[PDB]
Amino acid sequence: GAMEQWCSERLDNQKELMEELYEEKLKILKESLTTFYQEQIQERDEKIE
Amino acid sequence: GAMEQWCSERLDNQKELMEELYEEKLKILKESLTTFYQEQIQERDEK
Amino acid sequence: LRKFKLVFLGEQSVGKTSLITRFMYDSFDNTYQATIGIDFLSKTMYLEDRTVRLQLWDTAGLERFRSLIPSYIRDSTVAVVVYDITNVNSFQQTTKWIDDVRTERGSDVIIMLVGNKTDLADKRQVSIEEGERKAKELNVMFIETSAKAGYNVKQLFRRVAAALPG
Amino acid sequence: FKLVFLGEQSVGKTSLITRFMYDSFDNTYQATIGIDFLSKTMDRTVRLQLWDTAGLERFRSLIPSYIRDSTVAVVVYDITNVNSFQQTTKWIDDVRTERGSDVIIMLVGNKTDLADKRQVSIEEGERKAKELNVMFIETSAKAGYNVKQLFRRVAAALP
Numbered sequence A: 001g002a003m004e005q006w007c008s009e010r011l012d013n014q015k016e017l018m019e020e021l022y023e024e025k026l027k028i029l030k031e032s033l034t035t036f037y038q039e040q041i042q043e044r045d046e047k048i049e
Numbered sequence B: 001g002a003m004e005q006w007c008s009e010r011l012d013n014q015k016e017l018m019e020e021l022y023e024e025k026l027k028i029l030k031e032s033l034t035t036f037y038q039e040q041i042q043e044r045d046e047k
Numbered sequence C: 001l002r003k004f005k006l007v008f009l010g011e012q013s014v015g016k017t018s019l020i021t022r023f024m025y026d027s028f029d030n031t032y033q034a035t036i037g038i039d040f041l042s043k044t045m046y047l048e049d050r051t052v053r054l055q056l057w058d059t060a061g062l063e064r065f066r067s068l069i070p071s072y073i074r075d076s077t078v079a080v081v082v083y084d085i086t087n088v089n090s091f092q093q094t095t096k097w098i099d100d101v102r103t104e105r106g107s108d109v110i111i112m113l114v115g116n117k118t119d120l121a122d123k124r125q126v127s128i129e130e131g132e133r134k135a136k137e138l139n140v141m142f143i144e145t146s147a148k149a150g151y152n153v154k155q156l157f158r159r160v161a162a163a164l165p166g
Numbered sequence D: 001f002k003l004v005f006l007g008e009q010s011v012g013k014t015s016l017i018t019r020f021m022y023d024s025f026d027n028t029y030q031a032t033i034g035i036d037f038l039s040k041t042m043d044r045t046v047r048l049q050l051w052d053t054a055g056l057e058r059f060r061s062l063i064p065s066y067i068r069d070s071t072v073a074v075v076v077y078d079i080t081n082v083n084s085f086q087q088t089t090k091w092i093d094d095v096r097t098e099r100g101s102d103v104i105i106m107l108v109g110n111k112t113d114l115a116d117k118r119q120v121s122i123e124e125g126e127r128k129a130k131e132l133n134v135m136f137i138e139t140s141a142k143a144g145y146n147v148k149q150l151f152r153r154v155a156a157a158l159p
């Protein structure tokens, strides 16, 4: 009824926001790990002499 | 009242579960990339 | 601006990343850069009905990263399963990929089977008929593409977008 | 009750947690990558949820969100490194930006056992804690000095 609809709305909003927050964390984590390790790999790659 | 208490219980539960799920994603993602890149770095280091 | 999650699945080097790149930036790169674990991208599609934001989850084909993928299949709205028309193994594995998707989502998921690299005509080992029969067997959508030529990549995403829940 | 550990690289954040968690210590340095999570019990039912963050700059941008959800912030410096100490001002400011006055903050001067290398006096640490209105303690993760007190004192401050 009206009670189920009201809670569904609030449950949806929480799900939407937490998804947004954590998907951003996953992205940033991915980019940071990549950037971090690629530098270390680049340094050693520069050493072909 | 009774309505606010019922919805707060479900919101708390949903939040707790999603926290668990996403932290597991973060953890295993980090562990996978770490293991991979360390081997890469070792290969460069072993030569 | 409702949000939808697309996960891209398939064996290594079938063209998952190239399909996304062609759609997002209308470009292509011959140089192979293997996806490491997974990559996250986003794109808005202004449909006639409404606007939708597509989260694009680009997974790796490398076997070592397989354990990462289930949770993303689980949380996805759409699964795009890609194979390489010049590589029979990649095609044979798509039953397994679609099996995995159904296992996590059942019938509550949109699945598109993609036969990529049509431009490599003389190397083809999987006929378009075989691909179509497989998709029908498994009740999934089917399309052939060339990320390199920019053939049917827009059509791929338009078909997927049109199937999204309202 | 979530605790986030903050501070510059190699100050001893992970060692403090490992000492409290497992009563072990490693001399070999392994820089924390991203953010790691732990959980533990410790007279009442303690439900500690620890977030161990990286001192490496590359992973700084990941931290803010975790400070928001953390009821406690543990800001660590190295008593043998004056720069690590100076930066705790910035760390504490950030904790205030995300939590204001509704947060428990503990300033930790770690590595007391390296007496011959001390660059920061205990008086300087006590002063900064008073100035910034946060709790203060000096520790040695290696010796296990005040590691138990650190968590006991932080726990007693929880709502």
Ligand SMILES: Nc1nc2c(ncn2[C@@H]2O[C@H](COP(=O)(O)OP(=O)(O)OP(=O)(O)O)[C@@H](O)[C@H]2O)c(=O)[nH]1
Binding pocket: C010, C011, C012, C013, C014, C015, C016, C017, C018, C019, C029, C030, C031, C032, C033, C034, C035, C036, C059, C060, C061, C062, C116, C117, C118, C119, C120, C145, C146, C147, C148, C149
């Ligand atoms: N000729 C041709 N080559 C393609 C096409 N699509 C992708 N490629 C090439 O195939 C190789 C693999 O492409 P990717 O997009 O990186 O494949 P992938 O599925 O993302 O690979 P992984 O992420 O490692 O699983 C690259 O060298 C691409 O240039 C295509 O349509 N035609």
Ligand SMILES: Nc1nc2c(ncn2[C@@H]2O[C@H](COP(=O)(O)OP(=O)(O)OP(=O)(O)O)[C@@H](O)[C@H]2O)c(=O)[nH]1
Binding pocket: D007, D008, D009, D010, D011, D012, D013, D014, D015, D016, D026, D027, D028, D029, D030, D031, D032, D033, D053, D054, D055, D056, D110, D111, D112, D113, D114, D139, D140, D141, D142, D143
């Ligand atoms: N002598 C002494 N060494 C310590 C003490 N605590 C930590 N260390 C050493 O200092 C180095 C850094 O310790 P970590 O715990 O990894 O420092 P951290 O803050 O977690 O480093 P990041 O995660 O990179 O920010 C390691 O080699 C430890 O062995 C201590 O109390 N006394």
Ligand SMILES: [Mg+2]
Binding pocket: C016, C017, C018, C033, C034, C035, C058, C059, C060, C061
């Ligand atoms: Mg790829």
Ligand SMILES: [Mg+2]
Binding pocket: D013, D014, D015, D030, D031, D032, D052, D053, D054, D055
């Ligand atoms: Mg650490």
